[PDB]
């Protein structure tokens, strides 16, 4: 049943208890921008 | 240039060949203007110290 409508789907749905897992990659530390920051020394590009 | 010129008319493909291959070079430094004796340096250009840092 669908807890927005409260219809019940068309077809069946399969469903149970499944192993899942929460990698290492996480979206806090691999976020990143900026405006201006530090250049290189030798050539004025930013750095990376 | 003048030589070589004699010299790629030459029969022969081998030497008219070489002969090309050469004056093409040749040409080079005449219709450039430079010349080959600077291939040799006397003064090593040094790059600027922030350049080398």
Redesign the interface.
Known sequence: YDGRTGEPFEGPIVVGQMFIMKLYHMVEDKMHARSTGPYS??TQQPLG | ERELLEEMKHPSRARRAKARKRLEVVRAFLDSGNRPEWMILEAVPVLPP??R?
């Open positions: 020394l030798i | 922030d350049l840092p």
